[PDB]
Design a binder for these strands. Sequence first.
RNA 1: CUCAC
DNA 2: TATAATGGGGGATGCA
DNA 3: TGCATCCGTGAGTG
Lengths: 38, 94, 1111, 161, 158, 103, 83, 8, 210
Amino acid sequence: SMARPVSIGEAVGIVAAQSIGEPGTQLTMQGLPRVIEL
Amino acid sequence: AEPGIDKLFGMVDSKYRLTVVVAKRAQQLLRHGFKNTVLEPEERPKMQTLEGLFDDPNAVTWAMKELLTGRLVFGENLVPEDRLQKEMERLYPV
Amino acid sequence: MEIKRFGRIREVIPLPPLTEIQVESYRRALQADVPPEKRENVGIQAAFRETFPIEELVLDFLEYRLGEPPFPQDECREKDLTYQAPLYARLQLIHKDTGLIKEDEVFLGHIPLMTEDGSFIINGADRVIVSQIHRSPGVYFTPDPARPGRYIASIIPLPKRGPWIDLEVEPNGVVSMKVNKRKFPLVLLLRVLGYDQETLARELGAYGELVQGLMDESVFAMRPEEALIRLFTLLRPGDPPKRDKAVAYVYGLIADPRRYDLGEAGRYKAEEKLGIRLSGRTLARFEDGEFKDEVFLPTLRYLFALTAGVPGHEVDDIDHLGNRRIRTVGELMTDQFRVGLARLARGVRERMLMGSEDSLTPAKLVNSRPLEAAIREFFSRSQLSQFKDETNPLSSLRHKRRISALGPGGLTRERAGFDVRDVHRTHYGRICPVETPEGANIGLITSLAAYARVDELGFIRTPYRRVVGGVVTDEVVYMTATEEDRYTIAQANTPLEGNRIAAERVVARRKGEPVIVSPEEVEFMDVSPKQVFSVNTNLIPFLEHDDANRALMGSNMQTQAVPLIRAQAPVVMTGLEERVVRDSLAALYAEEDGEVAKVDGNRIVVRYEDGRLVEYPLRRFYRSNQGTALDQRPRVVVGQRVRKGDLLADGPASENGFLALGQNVLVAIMPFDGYNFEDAIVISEELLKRDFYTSIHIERYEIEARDTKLGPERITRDIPHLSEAALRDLDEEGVVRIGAEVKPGDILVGRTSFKGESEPTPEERLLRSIFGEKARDVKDTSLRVPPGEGGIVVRTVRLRRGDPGVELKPGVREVVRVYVAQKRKLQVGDKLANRHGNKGVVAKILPVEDMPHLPDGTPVDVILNPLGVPSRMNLGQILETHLGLAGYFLGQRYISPIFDGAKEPEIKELLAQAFEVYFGKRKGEGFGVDKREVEVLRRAEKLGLVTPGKTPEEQLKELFLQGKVVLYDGRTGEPIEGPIVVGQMFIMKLYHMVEDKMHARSTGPYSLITQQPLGGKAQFGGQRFGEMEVWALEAYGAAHTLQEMLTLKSDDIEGRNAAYEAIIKGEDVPEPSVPESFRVLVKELQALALDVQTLDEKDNPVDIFEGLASK
Amino acid sequence: ARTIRIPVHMVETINKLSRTARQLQQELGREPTYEEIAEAMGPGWDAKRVEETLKIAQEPVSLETPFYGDFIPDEHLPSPVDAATQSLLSEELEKALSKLSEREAMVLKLRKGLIDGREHTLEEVGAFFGVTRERIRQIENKALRKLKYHESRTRKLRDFL
Amino acid sequence: ITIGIDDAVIPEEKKQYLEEADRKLLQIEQAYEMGFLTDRERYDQILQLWTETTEKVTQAVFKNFEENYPFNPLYVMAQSGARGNPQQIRQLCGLRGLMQKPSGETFEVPVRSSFREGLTVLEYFISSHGARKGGADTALRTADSGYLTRKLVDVTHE
Amino acid sequence: EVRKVRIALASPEKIRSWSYGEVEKPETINYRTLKPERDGLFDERIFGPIKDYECACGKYKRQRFEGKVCERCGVEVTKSIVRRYRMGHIELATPAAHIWFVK
Amino acid sequence: LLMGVTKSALSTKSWLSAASFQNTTHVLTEAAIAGKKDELIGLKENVILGRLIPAGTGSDFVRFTQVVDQKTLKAIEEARKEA
Amino acid sequence: SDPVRQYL
Amino acid sequence: ALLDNGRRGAPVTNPGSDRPLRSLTDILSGKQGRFRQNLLGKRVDYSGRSVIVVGPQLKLHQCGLPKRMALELFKPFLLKKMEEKGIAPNVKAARRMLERQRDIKDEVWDALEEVIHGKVVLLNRAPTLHRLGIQAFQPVLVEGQSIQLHPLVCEAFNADFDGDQMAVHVPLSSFAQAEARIQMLSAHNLLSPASGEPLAKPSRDIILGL
RNA sequence: CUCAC
DNA sequence: TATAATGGGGGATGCA
DNA sequence: TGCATCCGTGAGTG
Ligand SMILES: Nc1ncnc2c1ncn2[C@@H]1O[C@H](COP(=O)(O)OP(=O)(O)OP(=O)(O)O)[C@@H](O)[C@H]1O
Ligand SMILES: [Mg+2]
Ligand SMILES: [Zn+2]
């Protein structure tokens, strides 16, 4: 989000989870089933 | 955006430390009645009321300006808590 | 005015009564107007003939009757009652031993009646019983998904009137059977019917893999009795196989026309499928001492010949509209009349066997409580019983013409997959392909087609003109789906000369699938393009240019149109906007010829030809269910000669007999400084000035005063510690006066309630004894005005106990209703929408001097961004806009039919006739061409729009035929650097307004157990900061903000009170403590015998309950 | 059978009401009023007693009814606004324990019930200072009248209603 | 910038393309009635042919737009990235294209008309199937997606 | 400071250790006075006072008494919040199995 | 050992996260049996507890950073020179 | 599994 | 049936309904459970909701907050500021002044302006699919009822203007304010956390113009 | 059932 | 308080 | 092969 070394304390896991989840939920409203299967 | 936020992000190793510093300094200024400020009357942030230019109530903005000046020391293990509280409350009554 | 209509197709039969799907159903169910001697065995009659007679004493049914309603419709809406009629039934008691005959007419309770429009009135509120689509009863054959070459046969009865029977051929050559989650070889059941081994080889006898594969000797070696016993032991482990128990159970589950009931439709379906006849709505029967079969053997015969290669044997499509049927209001009401009758019969049976087996009467033997409870349950709690949608006259119509697949007896949300949601090929002309809700209910909730109707068997019928040889007859043949699948059906627009197909080749349909066919091979033809669409869908002009995904939105958004005070019919119509007004019963018409005697705002008196003087009362400013005021206005003057079927009064959202959902406005399709960004809409302030988009909305504010164990609650004008400034608009009793301005915080009705042991604590006792004034015993509980609500009081309804005609619920003394109406003008936030899907929020309201105007000073009204057009693919609005532009200068309104409407060159001609009026007037007015119009003409000439080397008149004509004009920006006067499309558009104001949805909360009511703020504007509740929002704050790293959101702003009572107290004094918020709901969690875990311990770093317990849970 | 346990005889009475009203409904062709019931019950029965009997015969409903308990506020616990003013009333009142005295601002505490919760008459109060029921009265009215003059100069306690 | 029905420019190559498509369709039908091909080969070849033709008319639309009307509102919004995409514009000017059967397969009969020209009730009804299937697809998949999201959040929150 | 949260199995002795008195009657509140029943599902002698610093019979009525359980009715005079806290219990005759650890 | 996201979320060391996710009964039983203690390490734990999450401003790395002006920072260093 | 039938 | 109703055999129901009674298991577990409904997400004070609308005149770090909403959302601060000046005797009278709509003077709306100077609010739109589903904005008091939203942020929130609504939240502490202004401010979150690419970019009109 | 995605 | 009455009325996945 | 357990968010109305 800032194009620089990550600040210590950054909630990485949440950001990753939302970054994977957001496109899926939006690009819904053999794609997502495969993703879930993986 | 916030005035010179890139400089502030340059000041710290992590933005969250910056946030902590700003918040703590804001509380410091808020509790002592701004008396402990390291700003000069011309550097003091102002709001435009219907009367005129008065000092900015928002202590956060004050904290960011003072932090921009470079007249504040940050870091860990610099001074025991109770000592700082006592001495600061001594220098600037409430 | 001049109304020009297009279309060449000659529609024969008009639209059937749009509300007949409920009228003809309920009226057929009751048959109240038919003498009991000439009533068929359908509806209530069949229920009586199925429940009765009662076997123990033998109670027998004679006849029933329906009385007149104790209260009229408007009075039922007034006093929170049900519009119903008292039901009586003549029963005779017959002692099968003695011959004792006692006869009495018993009162079973009341039955809610259906009004003229096809709705209901339950407990003072209008409601609609939505018809339910479900899989029709009968016998079907679906391919086994596990085994490709094999097939499962299924026997489906009416819901809750029999089990589902499967005949899956197990991998062993012999057919099995599955009932009530059990499974057993069909052989044993086959033996019970009296089937010898010879009858299975003589009747069947064709395939040695199936016919002789069924025959197993270890089952044949027993009498029908023994086999029956064995099967009874197979089905109920624990019940001794007594001969009088097995027969009773088996008969009572399969052969009994009481617990098992196939459909009449299902009867004919099975009869036609198996090629046989059925003696009754049952699988078997008890005749001549033994059991005799009807269904199982032909079903097996069809099933076994399906696994082979036999013609006439096919798999049935279950989503087919020939195998799916519609249970209407009458049938749905019947299924809750039969159940409530069967529970009454139980109360009869459990009373005929104890008391006095000779000294009994049909009166004290019959308790009608389960019946009353049954019907009341069906009308006040059913899933198909919905709060009526009477926003505008069209909304109710659609609501009554909608078809639900859900409800008890249908599909659940998780039971609904893809296949049931799809649009089947047989939906053609029956179920609207367009009308369906967006979201989780798509494909389930639908709507009926315009020309579609439901027959006696619950199947939908669609009309088709007959074409013999080549001559198109006026004979219209309504067919079902399976009936449709027989013939070749050409399209309604195919070239016709008189009544002859003139097309060398026609576009036809065979079993749904399209095919180009010769005029000789044409048997039938569509009656109209309108037959394949809904009502709201048929109200969308230029629908053939609109995308379905937006047309759907168009339809659903018409339904939400608020009745405007200056409502008007669209300049571009389709033709149905008249019939819709007619059948919605919003407008008032003439019954016979004659002459209007008098006309008033309250009534219309007419002197007919018959000499009779009829007075028609006008419904003035009545609040509908959703708040939209339903008001009728007169449209005739005193002494006007009136014919039959002529208009007398206009309902809300109706103009001169035409549907007036929205208003016609001058719109310019162009961006505007970002105030058009993403569907947003910019309006002219000249719309508010002449009261365009302004509507009346009424809200009722009820209040009750009851008897307490502390004292009575009094509706008084005396309120402790108040002032006259707040009690100004109140009358002597304490009620607000009629015709007063009420704002948030104002008292509508004064009320005082005694305080309990909250008799002031000494902190308040001392304060009272200090201020001189003593503490009262009554406290202020007056009905105020909710924040964001208000208007003008128009009505007050005060009902009391001890007053003639009204008895309130136990404990309650008096009920008061304050009706507050308000006149809402269009404002920043209200939602506007057209019939083509284009919608948006009013983002900016500009003064007229900023509005892009025509060169002759005429300013536009609406500025719609063009960016909302290309991706939405709804070009119908553009084609509406051009013809509208033509209609703005010719002073014309149009009727452009669906799929047979105004084509391009005709609109070109009309526009050409409009340009002469728009331009020609200025050339003889002492005005040539403007200087900036030349610049616009230059840029447009570079755009390739106009022709190089032409007079400005000719070029501006070329632009006007393209629907484009020269537009002057009012802010500068300088023209828009190009021609802009400007026209007249039909735009409606929607039910979603900002005055309703705007909400805020500093603090307020908390829930009991959780101590967390409530949910809803009405309860002044907070906004739910759900899991995902927490994920947001976490992702940011906003720890203290999240902690605030989890504590101080929620259920941290200590922390929240300390927080508020900290802010009101000007301090920094305190450090939050542990949430109360967490303590609730801990105790809820202790109540589950689980020791939850909050430890420190030394594993030593830390008390978050602070020594309150420990002894 | 009931969540709210009812004495057996009362239950019998309610049942009697049920059967009676049911008969009346069966014969009238409509539901009975309180008056018809009270009449058909016999002597000593009026509409009021029928209504009250029906009021106590009510069965309580569930909170988790599809929830129903989510639209129900918590009337017991004080809100932040309530806790605030009550904590501003005591504050602006012990500003009166001052201006008065030590014994003055105590005859009021017993009289108004600040200490025990109950109001002690000028009779009982006399046995805590020795004074009789007319030095106590002057002891009281000196407090209030002085406090009344301490009003309209600080004008704090007016809105406190 | 504005939108008129004359801004939906039908390219002049469309008629030619429809003609060639019809003659090739006729050739395959000759390969069917005579028994030269099966019913599988026929259907597949028809599908391929019509998809190819759709591509052709798309390219025709965009080419005519680029060369003759570079400032045309539709072409402008499409190329700039303001709104719309090649497929939708093709539907607006060229043809609607092939449609979906409710099961999933494709109708061999395409929708030759466009939004500017206007469809027939049959073509519209045919398109309704695909539209419905799409809506149901969205509605039924959204839940699965959100579920997955919550799973990921739960598995990675620490 | 809290830095750990431990979950464990509750012994019957632990359950009785939490409790403030055994519930003997399936009765809720008085059908006339609307007050709780003695040894019922809402008894104040077990769970705690309904009003802040006040007993049932109204003897000890304020903060001058705290922890002092009344003699007449037998109700403590603490903060009325305790009825969201103080656990009760029911002594079964023949022991039953926790359905969780069973199924 | 490769494990799915659901199974890995349920098999975590924290019983609060696992309970708040899915199979609340199955988690709570086996957690109570082993006398499991939650160290409150993740995010959801501190969220349920209503504590300050160990991320961002609530991260121990930046949690205890002090701010002092040179004026006072020097004003205290004088008394801490002699006795 | 059914208390009624079991008791019967 | 007390601990886990419906677990074994049939669930116990109240007479007259097919509704299983809510046991101690049904309370804790499920989407309606205590955990997912009251521990991992609560309802909050100092939060409003309204129909949004486009506000092009706003700068990147701004939003249009109606005076009516801002009145309630900032009530406790306002009650203090109305005492620090003299619009009301104390806090209680100040609160009893804003009770009725007619009793609201004009100095109040100026004191409110004096209050919110510097402090920001949090705009949120459902479904909050990612971190940028909630963003910080400096409030600008407007007339009407609608919330004015910056155009450029309409991509992250996925917020068009066909009837959308947003919720507001007020950071109270000097810590919660710093977190919002430094970390949650829209002008500070320009690039996407998912890919690194700009999310606050010219679109629609803004492109069409250039 | 309706709004937004 | 004593005729006699005696047996009910989808959809997929993980794990044993 | 049977049982148990999951199946997106916020908001409005009666
Ligand atoms: N919030 C609501 N407002 C109005 N009608 C509603 C509402 N919820 C449900 N209904 C009615 O009930 C019918 C469908 O309800 P459904 O049974 O699907 O909801 P539900 O199962 O009660 O939801 P939940 O289980 O979350 O309470 C709807 O078609 C509508 O008639
Ligand atoms: Mg939207
Ligand atoms: Zn006591």
